[PDB]
Structure 1
Amino acid sequence: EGKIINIGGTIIKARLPKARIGAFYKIEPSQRLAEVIAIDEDEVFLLPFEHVSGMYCGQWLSYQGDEFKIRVGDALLGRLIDGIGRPMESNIVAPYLPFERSLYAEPPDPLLRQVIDQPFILGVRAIDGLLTCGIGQRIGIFAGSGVGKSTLLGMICNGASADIIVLALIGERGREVNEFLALLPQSTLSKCVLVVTTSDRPALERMKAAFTATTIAEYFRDQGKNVLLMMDSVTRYARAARDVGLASGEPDVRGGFPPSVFSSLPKLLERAGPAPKGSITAIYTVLLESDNVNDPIGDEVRSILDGHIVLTRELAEENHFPAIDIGLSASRVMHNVVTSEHLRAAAECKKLIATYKNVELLIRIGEYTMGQDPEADKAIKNRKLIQNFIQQSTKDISSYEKTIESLFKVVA
């Protein structure tokens, strides 16, 4: 037991002699749980699973657990789970999950990871013709606010070729859990797990949803089947962890973020990828703070992740959707996957896009003798062909062969 002596907005400070970090306590009069996040030799910083309704001084605590585990198993497809691990829907009968796992595992050994050599057919024509994703790659989608990170996941998840899909909705609107279900048919809903926590929810449900989704992805990986994982705004995880750690006596470092965010983010983000048996392939939506690249939580996620898709709102103004900026974006694993003519044609049309992005100024001003600079002469004649290759509709999914045949047409 122990006494509660301090009630802030986010965190609780209590008196517990020799309490363990992670060891969760429930509150005796009112059934609500809390998890210890710091020690101050008698003053323990606990973090409650819920809201702070009435929290008087000297309210008691009681010991419940050594660390917080979730309950997983095969009887989990087609369900909706919150960040804690509880079933969110109440229309369905209560499941049977045989196994329990801790949320903090350790990544696979880097000597035993495989080599990515088979493409991940994705659906979008730019992210298959120009930036091919491999099965086992961890790509990321960097954009501002309302630039189209959520649509692009709809375009991917609609036409995705995975054996099993784990979709995490961290810290985001509850208006849209039904809109991700509205574009998932039952053929790709009978094998999908949605782990959803809303921005209404408290700080550590919103902080631990990423770990719950990664633990579930690791379970269906350790059965032996490759699995897609999609986190929507891992920046909502990073800002939940910032709010948790910063209100516990831990200083600012670079953007308001404590050291523990930069210490706990490359352990979440690294336990995907290849494995001795199976492979998680993951897609991390990252919400940039402003429209800059001097962002302390978008720059390191660009640094420790192979493949960054930079969406630009300076292309979303011209109604160019999806707003993929091919100049600022790259995929590290397309020189290990696709054929040599595919690499050559993709680099050819990236040259054509980059040449048209500075030749048209001397088109509008009348200084253009067609014939002297050959590359620009092929970058304007193939303008509308490239533009109808790059931007596509939300409901237009296309197989990998059609993307590469239109690629060979638009280069030739």
Structure 2
Amino acid sequence: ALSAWVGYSVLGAVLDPTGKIVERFTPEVAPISEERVIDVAPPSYASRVGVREPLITGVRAIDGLLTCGVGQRMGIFASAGCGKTMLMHMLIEQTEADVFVIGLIGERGREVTEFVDMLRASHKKEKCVLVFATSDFPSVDRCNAAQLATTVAEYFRDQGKRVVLFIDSMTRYARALRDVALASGERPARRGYPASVFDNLPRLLERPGATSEGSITAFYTVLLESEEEADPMADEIRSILDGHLYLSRKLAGQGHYPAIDVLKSVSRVFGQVTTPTHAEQASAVRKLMTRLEELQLFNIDNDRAMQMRDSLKAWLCQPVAQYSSFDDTLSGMNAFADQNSAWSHPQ
């Protein structure tokens, strides 16, 4: 029952896995803090509310085709070098919320330093709390890092705030759970992961969500560690979450950022967070996308098809510093849906 001090005193601060403020980039907002246990259970399913509103991320692809809900839990699935951390930075930059909580689990110390430098550059400095653990820490503290980030998010949610929590990565948190379980007598069950791991991923992953007070919307990064190897964890985490964003290294090599493969992504809350007009426009654009990709890798029909493909790829491509209001995103959605209605038809 390890506890830690959380609250307004950690705003604009960097916390080590035990809640010690090791750095600030903002004068302390206020000296208000509770003691809280960092590993508690999710709230009762019957105390939840529905994922109603959308969360406007300012990213066109997400807000248009994969709209997130306030209280949703979303995964960011990618192999190496596809831009998970950069997508996190863009989401922090362009999303509107009261508090942003980031949990860096088991990265190099220099990566922690680079993230904190980016955090210092931003205009939302006073709204952010970073909790970190490097690979040099024991696995216990790597688990405590994510648990503590979740606890900070929960504090500010109980204050009635819209919180956005990030965990980079859930792959490393799962491996740290595995190592702590193994190094205490527990036996492996599936791909060397002890059984308790599978009971302890949702325990953490089901803590975010909306309540009668405020809300926590959560993004978790998952590594697609190699083909045809061990990925029981990627699939299990996919199971636990309310959707996922897949980043293809195909698009990443082109420089098409964010490297979101829309056809491989889904927001399982899209139906209840979007208007019916938006929903049918999004279905039209998804039909158009899949119809175009059916051709891609194979006269004037093909001219129109591929120039439309270029237009769509350009509309999806968007730099980190660039922000798109929901209105602008929706009008672009309407235009491409129009392009599905009046279509060239090469078959």
TM-score, shorter chain, exceeding 0.5: yes
After superposition, the Cα gap between the structure-2 partners of 1:404 and 1:266, relative to the gap in structure 1 and judged at 3 Å, is same
1:136 matched residue in structure 2: 71
Once structures 1 and 2 are overlaid, which stretch shifts more, 394-403 or 377-386?
377-386
2:18 matched residue in structure 1: 84
Q: How does 1:80-119 map to 2 (within 5 A)?
A: 80-89=14-23, 96=31, 98-119=33-54
Once structures 1 and 2 are overlaid, which stretch shifts more, 86-95 or 238-247?
86-95
1:311-333 residue CA offsets vs partner (Å, 9 max, x unmatched): 12233233332221122211111
Q: Secondary structure at the match of 2:293?
A: helix
| Structure 2, unpaired ranges of 5+ | 339-347
2:343 matched residue in structure 1: none
Q: How does 1:144-223 map to 2 (within 5 A)?
A: 144-184=79-119, 187-223=123-159
1:59-110 residue CA offsets vs partner (Å, 9 max, x unmatched): xxxxxxxx32111232221111011111112899999554211122222221
The structure whose RCO (Cα within 8 Å, separation 6+) is larger is 2
After superposition, the Cα gap between the structure-2 partners of 1:193 and 1:369, relative to the gap in structure 1 and judged at 3 Å, is closer
After superposition, the Cα gap between the structure-2 partners of 1:79 and 1:115, relative to the gap in structure 1 and judged at 3 Å, is same
The answer to whether 1:70 aligns with 2:4 is: yes
Once structures 1 and 2 are overlaid, which stretch shifts more, 122-131 or 292-301?
292-301
Distance 2:281 2:26 in 1: 50
1:6 matched residue in structure 2: none
Among residues 245, 249, 253, which one is paired with 1:313 in the alignment?
Answer: 249
Q: Which has the higher helix share?
A: 2
Q: Secondary structure at the match of 2:217?
A: strand
Q: Is the 8 A contact 1:71 1:97 kept in 2?
A: no
Amino acid at match of 1:281: T
Q: Is the 8 A contact 1:123 1:159 kept in 2?
A: yes
Distance 1:328 1:293 in 2: 20
**TM-score between the two structures when normalised by the length of structure 1:** 0.76
1:384 matched residue in structure 2: 310
Amino acid at match of 2:296: E
How far apart are 1:360 and its partner, in Å?
A: 3.0
Q: Secondary structure at the match of 2:103?
A: strand
Amino acid at match of 2:115: F
Q: Is the 8 A contact 1:147 1:313 kept in 2?
A: yes
After superposition, the Cα gap between the structure-2 partners of 1:117 and 1:202, relative to the gap in structure 1 and judged at 3 Å, is same
How far apart are 1:172 and its partner, in Å?
A: 1.4
Distance 1:294 1:360 in 2: 32
Q: How does 1:11-410 map to 2 (within 5 A)?
A: 67-89=1-23, 96=31, 98-184=33-119, 187-291=123-227, 295-362=231-298, 370=301, 379-410=305-336
Distance 1:334 1:238 in 2: 28
Distance 2:159 2:211 in 1: 12
How far apart are 1:361 and its partner, in Å?
A: 4.2
Amino acid at match of 2:65: L
Q: Which has the larger radius of gyration?
A: 1
Q: Secondary structure at the match of 1:167?
A: strand
Q: Is the 8 A contact 2:12 2:26 kept in 1?
A: no
Distance 1:258 1:269 in 2: 18
Q: Secondary structure at the match of 1:100?
A: strand
Distance 2:128 2:96 in 1: 12
Q: Is the 8 A contact 1:76 1:97 kept in 2?
A: no
Distance 2:254 2:52 in 1: 36
Aligned length: 336
Distance 1:191 1:93 in 2: 12
Q: Secondary structure at the match of 2:294?
A: helix
Q: Is the 8 A contact 2:78 2:248 kept in 1?
A: yes
Q: Secondary structure at the match of 2:225?
A: coil
**TM-score between the two structures when normalised by the length of structure 2:** 0.89
1:255-288 residue CA offsets vs partner (Å, 9 max, x unmatched): 2211121111110000111123211111111122
| Structure 1, unpaired ranges of 5+ | 1-66, 363-367, 371-375
Q: Secondary structure at the match of 1:317?
A: helix
Q: Is the 8 A contact 1:386 1:410 kept in 2?
A: yes
Distance 1:112 1:242 in 2: 30
How far apart are 1:224 and its partner, in Å?
A: 1.5
After superposition, the Cα gap between the structure-2 partners of 1:166 and 1:360, relative to the gap in structure 1 and judged at 3 Å, is closer
After superposition, the Cα gap between the structure-2 partners of 1:262 and 1:321, relative to the gap in structure 1 and judged at 3 Å, is same
Backbone CA RMSD of aligned residues: 2.4
1:411 matched residue in structure 2: 337
